[PDB]
C-alpha cells in the first residue's frame, strides 16, 4: 504494498471493542514510523516509534490539539526492528487505546480526545512497507 502515507477511514469513528490491525515490514535503516488517529486536524493518538533519538530507540505518544502537541508519553520497550515484519494491533477500550506489537502488549494511551466517534481517520506514515491496514469488532 500500500502507498505510504496511507489514510484508513474509520467510518463513524472509533468505539470500544474496535481492533485495528496494521501489518508491514520496517525498511532498512528506518528512522521513524507514525500512526495518527485523527479527529479532523487534531491528532487524538499519535504513536511514534523513533529508531534514533539521541542514539536511543523510543516510542513517543502524544495528542495534537489546535496544532499544539501536548505532553509526551514515552515507552522504551521497543519491539520494532529495521528490516523486519511486524504486526501492530490497536484495540480501542473504554478509557484507552491498547497497543500490542507482534502479539505482545506494549502500551496503553488514555483517551485525551473523548469524542471517540469523531476520531474517524487513521494515518500511517514513515519508514515501512505497508502490507495491510484494517479493522474489526471483537
Ligand X SMILES: OC[C@H]1O[C@H](Sc2cccc(Br)c2)[C@H](O)[C@@H](n2cc(-c3cc(F)c(F)c(F)c3)nn2)[C@H]1O
83 annotated binding-site participant: no
Instruction: Give whichever of 120 and 125 is closer to ligand X, judged by the CB atom.
Output: 125
Least distance between ligand X and beta carbon 49 (Å): 7
Nearest to 75 by CA among 44, 45, 48: 48
Instruction: Give whichever of 72 and 93 is closer to ligand X, judged by the CB atom.
Output: 72
Instruction: Give whichever of 94 and 131 is closer to ligand X, judged by the CB atom.
Output: 131
Instruction: Give whichever of 62 and 75 is closer to ligand X, judged by the CB atom.
Output: 62
Give 101's Cβ-side CA count (13 Å radius): 18
* Contact by Cβ (8 Å): 138, 19: yes
75 annotated binding-site participant: yes
Binding site for ligand X (CB under 6 A): 32-34, 46, 48, 60, 62, 69, 72, 125-126
Whose CB is nearest to ligand X? 126
Instruction: Let me know how long the chain is.
Output: 138
118 annotated binding-site participant: no
Least distance between ligand X and beta carbon 35 (Å): 9
70 annotated binding-site participant: yes
The C-alpha atoms of residue 20 and residue 44 are separated, in whole angstroms, by 15
Residue 78, C-alpha cell as written in the block: 521497543
Q: How many CB atoms lie within 10 A of CB 8?
A: 18
Least distance between ligand X and beta carbon 12 (Å): 26
| Helix H or strand E encompassing 91 | strand 85-92
Annotated binding site for a beta-D-galactoside: 69-75
Amino acid at each position: 504494498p500500500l502507498i505510504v502515507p496511507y489514510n484508513l477511514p474509520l467510518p463513524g469513528g472509533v468505539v470500544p471493542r474496535m481492533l485495528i490491525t496494521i501489518l508491514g515490514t520496517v525498511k532498512p535503516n528506518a528512522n521513524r514510523i507514525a500512526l495518527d488517529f485523527q479527529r479532523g486536524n487534531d491528532v487524538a493518538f499519535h504513536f511514534n516509534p523513533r529508531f534514533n533519538e539521541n542514539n536511543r530507540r523510543v516510542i513517543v505518544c502524544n495528542t495534537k490539539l489546535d496544532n499544539n502537541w501536548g505532553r509526551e508519553e514515552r515507552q522504551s520497550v521497543f519491539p520494532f526492528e529495521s528490516g523486519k515484519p511486524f504486526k501492530i494491533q490497536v484495540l480501542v477500550e473504554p478509557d484507552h487505546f491498547k497497543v500490542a506489537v507482534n502479539d505482545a502488549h506494549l502500551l496503553q494511551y488514555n483517551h485525551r480526545v473523548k469524542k471517540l466517534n469523531e476520531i474517524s481517520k487513521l494515518g500511517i506514515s514513515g519508514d515501512i512497507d505497508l502490507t495491510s491496514a484494517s479493522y474489526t469488532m471483537i
